[PDB]
Amino acid sequence: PNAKYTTTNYFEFYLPYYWNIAPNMDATITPHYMHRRGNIMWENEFRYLSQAGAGLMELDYLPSDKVYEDEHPNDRRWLFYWNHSGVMDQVWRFNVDYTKVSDPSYFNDFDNKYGSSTDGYATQKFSVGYAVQNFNATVSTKQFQVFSSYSAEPQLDVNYYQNDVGPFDTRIYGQAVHFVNTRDDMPEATRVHLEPTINLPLSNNWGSINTEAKLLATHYQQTNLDWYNSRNTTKLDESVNRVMPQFKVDGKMVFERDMEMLAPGYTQTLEPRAQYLYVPYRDQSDIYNYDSSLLQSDYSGLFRDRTYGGLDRIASANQVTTGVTSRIYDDAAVERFNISVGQIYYFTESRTGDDNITWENDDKTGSLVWAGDTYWRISERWGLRGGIQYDTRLDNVATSNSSIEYRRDEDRLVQLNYRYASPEYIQATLPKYYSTAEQYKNGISQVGAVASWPIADRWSIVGAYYYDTNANKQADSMLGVQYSSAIRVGYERKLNGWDNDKQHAVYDNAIGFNIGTQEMLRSNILPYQNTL
Amino acid sequence: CGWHLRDTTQVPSTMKVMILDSGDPNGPLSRAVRNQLRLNGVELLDKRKDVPSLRLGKVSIAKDTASVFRNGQTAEYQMIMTVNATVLIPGRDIYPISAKVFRSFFDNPQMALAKDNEQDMIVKEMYDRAAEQLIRKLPSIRAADIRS
Numbered sequence: 278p279n280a281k282y283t284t285t286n287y288f289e290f291y292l293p294y295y296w297n298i299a300p301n302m303d304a305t306i307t308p309h310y311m312h313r314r315g316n317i318m319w320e321n322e323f324r325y326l327s328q329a330g331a332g333l334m335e336l337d338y339l340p341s342d343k344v345y346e347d348e349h350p351n352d353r354r355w356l357f358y359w360n361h362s363g364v365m366d367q368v369w370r371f372n373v374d375y376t377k378v379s380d381p382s383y384f385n386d387f388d389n390k391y392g393s394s395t396d397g398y399a400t401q402k403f404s405v406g407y408a409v410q411n412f413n414a415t416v417s418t419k420q421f422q423v424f425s426s427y428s429a430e431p432q433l434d435v436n437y438y439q440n441d442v443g444p445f446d447t448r449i450y451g452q453a454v455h456f457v458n459t460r461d462d463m464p465e466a467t468r469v470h471l472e473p474t475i476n477l478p479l480s481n482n483w484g485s486i487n488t489e490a491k492l493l494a495t496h497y498q499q500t501n502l503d504w505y506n507s508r509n510t511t512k513l514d515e516s517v518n519r520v521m522p523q524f525k526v527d528g529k530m531v532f533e534r535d536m537e538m539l540a541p542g543y544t545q546t547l548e549p550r551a552q553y554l555y556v557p558y559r560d561q562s563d564i565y566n567y568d569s570s571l572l573q574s575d576y577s578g579l580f581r582d583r584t585y586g587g588l589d590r591i592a593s594a595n596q597v598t599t600g601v602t603s604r605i606y607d608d609a610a611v612e613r614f615n616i617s618v619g620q621i622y623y624f625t626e627s628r629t630g631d632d633n634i635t636w637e638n639d640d641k642t643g644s645l646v647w648a649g650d651t652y653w654r655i656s657e658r659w660g661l662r663g664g665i666q667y668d669t670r671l672d673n674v675a676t677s678n679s680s681i682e683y684r685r686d687e688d689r690l691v692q693l694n695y696r697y698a699s700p701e702y703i704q705a706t707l708p709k710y711y712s713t714a715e716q717y718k719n720g721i722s723q724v725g726a727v728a729s730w731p732i733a734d735r736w737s738i739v740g741a742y743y744y745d746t747n748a749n750k751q752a753d754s755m756l757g758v759q760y761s762s763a764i765r766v767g768y769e770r771k772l773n774g775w776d777n778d779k780q781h782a783v784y785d786n787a788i789g790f791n792i793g794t795q796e797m798l799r800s801n802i803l804p805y806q807n808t809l
Numbered sequence: 810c811g812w813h814l815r816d817t818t819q820v821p822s823t824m825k826v827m828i829l830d831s832g833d834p835n836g837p838l839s840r841a842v843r844n845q846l847r848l849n850g851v852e853l854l855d856k857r858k859d860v861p862s863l864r865l866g867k868v869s870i871a872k873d874t875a876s877v878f879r880n881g882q883t884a885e886y887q888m889i890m891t892v893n894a895t896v897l898i899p900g901r902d903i904y905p906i907s908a909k910v911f912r913s914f915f916d917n918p919q920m921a922l923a924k925d926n927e928q929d930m931i932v933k934e935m936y937d938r939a940a941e942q943l944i945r946k947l948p949s950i951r952a953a954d955i956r957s
Contacts, residue, residue, distance in 0.1 A: 364833050395874045395883045400925070408835040421921035429922060440847075478848060483814035529814040547812065570923035572930075573914050577938060585926035609956070610949040662911070678875075678913070696876045696885065698915075708919050714878040717932030723876055745879065752877050772881025782879055802881070804873050804891055807910070 283787040285386065285773065288312040301326040315343040318354075320385075329371050330363015335391050345382075359389040370406030370415070376607070377401065381424035385774055389799040394773050394785070395802050398423045412437050426459045427567050443802050448474045448553055452588070456567045462504040464513060464565045469496040474685075484530040491523040493556075495588060497564055504521055514563045521591065525582060542608040550600045552580055554702070554710070558593040560630035566590060570633065573676070574666055575616045576600065576648040584627060595625040611654075618649040636670040637701055645669040655777040660809040671701040676713055680808045688737055688794045694725040694807060716775055716782070722746040727805050730792040735761045741799040750782070757797035771802050819849055820944065821951035828850045828862035837933070838892060841940040849944060859899055863943075866893035870932065875913060877912055883916045888928075890935045894943055896950050902957060904950045908942035910935045 281289040293307040296631035302325035302386040309318040323334040339354040348350075360375035376399045378384070384392050385780055392399065401602035402419035413436050419429040432454040440446045456465060476489035497517040506512050529550045536543035568587030572578065579600055584592040600619025607613050626641035647667040654660050661681045668675040680694040682706060697722040704712040711717035725743045731737045744750070752772055759765040764790065773785035821850065827846065832904055842865060854860055868891070875887035892908040912931050921955045923955050 363888065364836065368831065368837070386881060393874065393883075394881060395877060397882055397916055400921075413835075417923055419922055421925075423921060425918050427920075427922045480848070480850065480926055482818050531819075533815050534811050534813070546815070566920075566923070568918055568923045568926045570917065570927050570928065575912070579933065583930070586930050587923055606949075610952040612945060612949075628837060663842050676913075698876075698884065706915065707917060707944045717880070719885050721876050721878075747878055754880070761907050772877060772879065775880040782881065804875060805885060806873055806875075806911075809909075 278792065279544050280497070280790045281388075283388075283785060283789065285785050285787075286311055286313045309337075314339070316341055320389075327363070329365050330361055332359065332361035332363075332373065332635055333391075334359050335389075337389065339385070344386075345380075353379060354383060354386075356383060356387070356389065356392070360391075368407055368409060370404070370408055372404045372406075374400060374401070374402040377422060384424075394771065395804060397425060411439065422593070423459075427463075428457050429454050429568070430457050431455065445475050445477050447476075450474070464502055464589075465500045466565065466567060467498045468567075468588065469647050470494070483532075485525065485526070489525040489527070491582075493519070493521040493523055493591060495519045499565065511562045513565055517564055519559055519561065519564070519591075519795070521556060521559050523582060523594075524555040527580070528552070536605060539605070540607070543759040544606040544610065545615075546604040546606070548600075548602040548604070550580070550602075552598045554582060554584075554594045554596050554598070556591065556594040558628060558630075559591070561590055563629040564589055564631075565629070574621075574646050574648055574668075575664060576619055576650045579619045579621055579646070579648055585629075590629045590631065592627045592629045593625065594627065596621055596623045596627070599620075614651075614653045617649040619647070620644050621646040634705055635709075636674045636705065638670050639748070640669070643669075654809070658685055662808055668702075671699060671705065672699050673699045675699055677703045678708075682808045684807070684809055688729055688731050689727050690727075690794075692725075692727040692805070694720055694727075695725045696725075715780055719747045724750060726804065727798065729798060735798075737761070739794055741798070741801055741803070743803050753801055753803045755801040757791045757800070759797065761793070763792070765793055765797070765801060767791075767797065769801055820846075820851055820947055824861055824947055824950060826854065826857070826860050828856060828860050829865070830862050831865040832858055833865075835935045837937065839865060839937040842943060845937075845940040845944050847934045847935070860943060861898045862894055864895050864897065867952065868892050870935075872928070874956065880946060885913050886928075886929060888912045888914075890932070890939055892939045894921055897949075898950075898954060901954060906943065906946040906950070906952060908939040908946075910938045 279291040284386040290310045291307050291455050293305055294346060296304045296306060305322040307320045310322050311318065318337060318339045321336040326333055335356065335358040337356040342354045344352060358376040359373050361371060363371045365371060378399055383392050384396055390399050394716045396433045399422040400449065401420035402418065404415055406413060406415040413432045417432045419432060433452060436448065436450045438448045446682065452470040455467050470492045472491055474489065474491045476487055479486050499513055499515055501515050505797040536546040564587045567587035568754060569590040571582060572586050579598045598619065598621045602615060602617040604612055605614040622644045623642050650666050663679045664677060665674060666676040677697040678695060680692060682692040700718060700720040703717060703720055721746055723743060727741045729737065729739045737759050741755040743752040745752050754770050756768040768788050770784055770786045774783035776783060829843060829936050833839060843853065869886065870890050872886045872888045874883045876884040894905040894906050894908065896907045912935060914927055914931060
C-alpha cells in the first residue's frame, strides 16, 4: 500500500495490484480510495514493448465524484493517457503523445504521473514518420484540449537533401496542413508550403563563410471567413499565394592565445561571427495566424532566419546579427569556461503587415536586440550558468536566468537558481489580458533553492524552496525523507489556483507515505534539473 | 595582445577520417552529427579497420516547468537534451563523452499549436548544439589518448 493527506482531498490510500501475463507487457491496477470523495477512483496503467516501439497507457476512472457533484451542480471523472515512441526497422518513426480528461479541473484535483496542476492544456498527438539518409516524410495530428483551440488535422512535413551538386549542397522542405478549430465560427485553412534551398559552404582551419538562398512559397485556401470578416476592418482572402526570396550570409573566424598567465599551458579561443539576412516585405494581414508565435532570442537564437515559430508570419529582414564567443580550455584540452555576447542591428523595420505587438519605444531601426550566455565548469563538482536577453524596444532586460550547482554524488547536491522575465516582456509576447490580470502582469522574478544529503548511512533527506521576489511569497516548497534497505515520506506546498474577487492565490498542501534522491527531487512542480 | 588565427583544424588530424555508428542512423541527432562532421571536412566511412568509430548512444529529452505565474500555472518551460556518445580508437581505449543543452520558452494556452511549432523548432536547434558540443570533445580525446 501507499497513503496520503492533502488540503485538496483529505485522506487517501492506494492498493496497487501488479499483473504479469506476457514477457513483453504488464499492468498495474490500483483502487485509489479517497475520503473527501465517496468513491474509489480506479487507476489502470499498462506497459508494453513491441516491434513498433515502447509505450505507456493510463486509464483513471471515478464512477461518480461527490465533490464535483456539489461544486458543479445540475450536471464521472476520468483521464486517459498514451505515450509511444519507436523506430521500426530503421525507417518507421512511430510516435504517440496523447492525453484526454473529462473536464478542465482534473489536474487541480488529482495528483498523477502524467499531467500537472501547472498545465494550461492537455496535448493530443499522433505521428508516423518515414526516414532515410537523403529523405524523410512525416504525417501527424496536433490537437490540444485547452482548460482556461486550433488543431492541425492532418499535417504532412517532407524533406529531401542532395549534397555535392557542384560546390553547393541543396535541400527542399515541403508541407501540407489542414487547420480545424474547436469553434464552429472560426476560419479554416488548407496550407501548402514549398521551400527549395541552395547553399555554398566554404571553410578552412581558421574560419568559414556559408552563403544560402531560399525561395519561400506558400499557398492558402481559407474557408469559414464570414464571422471573422464581419467583425474586422482588414479582411482575410479565400485564396492567398505568398512568394518571397530569402538570402543569408554566415561568416565566422577563430583566434587563439597562450593562457600561461592564468595557469600552466591553458588555452584561450576567440570566435567572432557575423551573419547578414535579407527577406523582402510581403503583407500577411489577409492570412489568419494558425501557428506562428513570436520567438525568444537567446544568444544562439540571434542567428535564426525566422522571427516567428511557424509559417503564417514571416517578417521582412535587412539585418546584421553580430556575436563573439570566447572559451578557455585546460591543459587536457577540456573546456573550462565560455562566454558569448551578441546583438542584432536592423537597417529597416522587421515588419510582417499584421504588426500586432506593443513596445515601450517607437524606434525600429539600429542595434536593438542583445543577448549573452556564460558557462563555467568551476571544477568536476561545481558549475555556474547564466543568460541575459535585452531589447531596446522594451527599454529593459527582457529575460534572464542563472544557476550555480554543487554535486558530490547522485545523493549529495545543492543548487541555487534564478529566473526573471520583465513586465514589459510579458505585455509584449503573451495574451493581452496577461498585461492586466494581477497573477500574470508582474513578470517573473523567481529564486529557487534545491538540496539533497544522506543524513546517515541509510537515510536520505531532500528539499526545495521557490520564492517569488515580486509577490514576496513562496511558489513551491518540498521536503522528503527516505530510509533504505525501504520507506519514503514526502511533503509539498504549491500554488494551485487563484481566488477571483479576493485577488489572492490558492495553496495545496500535501503529505505522502510509501513502502531515492532523484525520484524525490523530480516529485514537485518546478522539478530538479541537473545544471552541470 | 598575443592573438593568432587558429593554425590547425578543429577536428584532430587522426580523426579527419572516421566511422559513424548509431542504433538510429536516420534520426535527427545522427543527421546533425553527420552534418557537423562533414562541415568540418571529416571523411565518413561505412560501419579501413584502423579508423576510429564515433558511436552515438542513449539520447533523452525532457521539458519541465522552469517557472510559474502567481496562480501556479507554467510561465516558462525549460527543455534539456542529454546525448551520450563514445569514441572507440582501435588498438587503444574507449573514450566516453557527452553533450547537454538547455533551452527555454514561454507557454501560451491560446495559440497552443503555435507553441508546439516553437517547441519542435527548438528541439531541431538543440540537436545542432548537441552536435557542435560533441565535435569540441574530439580535441580532448586526442590529448587524453596521447597522455594514456
